[PDB]
Amino acid sequence: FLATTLERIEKNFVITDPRLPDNPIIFASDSFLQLTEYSREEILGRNCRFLQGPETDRATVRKIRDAIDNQTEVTVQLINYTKSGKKFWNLFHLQPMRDQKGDVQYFIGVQLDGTEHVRDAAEREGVMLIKKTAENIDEAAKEL
Ligand SMILES: *[C@@]12=NC3=[C]C([C])=C([C])[C]=C3N([C][C]([O])[C]([O])[C]([O])[C]OP([O])([O])=O)C1=NC(=O)[N]C2=O
């Protein structure tokens, strides 16, 4: 699956379609593929939960479930795994994308990878970056 211009935006993100069974990934940027080690054909049509593994905090996963069910934004940190099983920390931001009547049409997820759980200045700078990125992608996705 060749990258669309959207997917060549130089940021780590995915877009899912909550109309399709299990809210699957339909767009995944090249940097997301580089991070996770999967090809685009391997992850399209799958729910993002395949990135989770034994050390993933399930309490945090439930925070994300609740955000999606209530169609609201969330920002959390959790451990995720690459295809080859390497752990990374994921500073993750979710937000819905709404149409001209205000209904959610897609979800946008922005991921910032790190080697540790961040706090204080590193957390603040991380969250500044992922929120700004989410806004950029919301604009890009308006024409999908
Ligand atoms: C995945 N990012 C991500 C991006 C979007 C836009 C969405 C909608 C979800 C994710 N997930 C969360 C996952 O798909 C799921 O929502 C949760 O596991 C909670 O639901 P379940 O049914 O499992 O309780 C992401 N999960 C990750 O682990 N990493 C991300 O990058």
**Residue 144 CB neighbours (<10 A):** 13
Ligand 1: which residue has its CA nearest to atom 23? Answer: 49
User: 136: annotated binding-site residue?
Assistant: no
Cα separation, 29 vs 43, whole angstroms: 11
User: 90: annotated binding-site residue?
Assistant: yes
Contact, 73 vs 93, CB < 8 A? yes
- Resolution given for this structure, in angstroms: 1.5
Contact, 88 vs 116, CB < 8 A? no
Contact, 134 vs 126, CB < 8 A? no
Cα separation, 102 vs 141, whole angstroms: 15
User: In this structure, what CATH number is given to the domain that contains residue 47?
Assistant: 3.30.450.20
User: H-type helices in 3-119, by residue range?
Assistant: 30-36, 40-43, 58-69
Structure tokens belonging to residue 44 = 């399209």
Q: Which amino acid is at 34?
A: Q
Give the range of the structural domain holding residue 124, as residue numbers without chain letter.
Answer: 1-144
What is the pairing mode between strands 87-98 and 13-16?
A: unpaired
User: 124: annotated binding-site residue?
Assistant: no
Ligand 1: which residue has its CA nearest to atom 21? Answer: 65
81 SS3 class? strand
107 φ, ψ to 5°? -115, 140
Structure tokens belonging to residue 71 = 């169609």
Q: How many domains does the chain have?
A: 1
Cα separation, 12 vs 39, whole angstroms: 14
Cβ of 64 below 6 Å from ligand 1: yes
Cβ of 65 below 6 Å from ligand 1: yes
Cβ of 52 below 6 Å from ligand 1: yes
Atom of ligand 1 nearest to the CA of 51: 28
